[PDB]
Design a protein around this ligand. Structure first.
Ligand SMILES: CO[C@@H]1[C@@H](n2cc(-c3cc(F)c(F)c(F)c3)nn2)[C@@H](O)[C@@H](CO)O[C@@H]1Cc1cn(C2CCN(C(=O)NC(C)(C)C)CC2)nn1
Length: 138
């Protein structure tokens, strides 16, 4: 297993057709998970499954600029299950990040941070056993 929280370097930032694959297992009583695609201290793309927000499950996505969170984008389609092995794939496209979980399309997030070449770290945190974190070009 990998340490959680985990830092995955993205050397020279991200580019279209870069596919980031995160494999792990959701903890049995999971409350939260977060991916943070970072440009220095800024978070270009925060992907945040919440397992118990007002007694429902929701995906929250956002951007953090100068330590300020922006407007949230929310998705009630919630593919994660407590205790189960998962795969998150984030595909970088010219105008958005595309996320698929367990080989099913989940959501798209339009680029707010435009310096893709400076998004040089992925943070992985929360209620998971993390097995691997890697990237390839499709
Ligand atoms: C609790 O802090 C989370 C952030 N967070 C979570 C984590 C974390 C760490 C881990 F270690 C980990 F393992 C994990 F799973 C998650 N770290 N930070 C972050 O998720 C943020 C994502 O907006 O929401 C809140 C903070 C926040 C949110 N907001 C505003 C943003 C604009 N909003 C909005 O537009 N609302 C409408 C859509 C209804 C119009 C209202 C709410 N202001 N501050």
């Amino acid at each position: 297993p990998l340490i959680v929280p985990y830092n995955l370097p993205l050397p020279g930032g991200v580019v279209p057709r870069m596919l980031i694959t995160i494999l792990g297992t959701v903890k049995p009583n999971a409350n939260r998970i977060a991916l943070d695609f970072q440009r220095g201290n800024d978070v270009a793309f925060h992907f945040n499954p919440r397992f118990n927000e007002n007694n429902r499950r929701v995906i929250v996505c956002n951007t953090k600029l100068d330590n300020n969170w922006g407007r949230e984008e929310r998705q009630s389609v919630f593919p994660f299950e407590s205790g189960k092995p998962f795969k998150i794939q984030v595909l970088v496209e010219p105008d958005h990040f595309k996320v698929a979980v367990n080989d099913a399309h989940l959501l798209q997030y339009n680029h707010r941070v435009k310096k893709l070449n400076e998004i040089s770290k992925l943070g992985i945190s929360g209620d998971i056993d993390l097995t691997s974190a890697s990237y390839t070009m499709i």
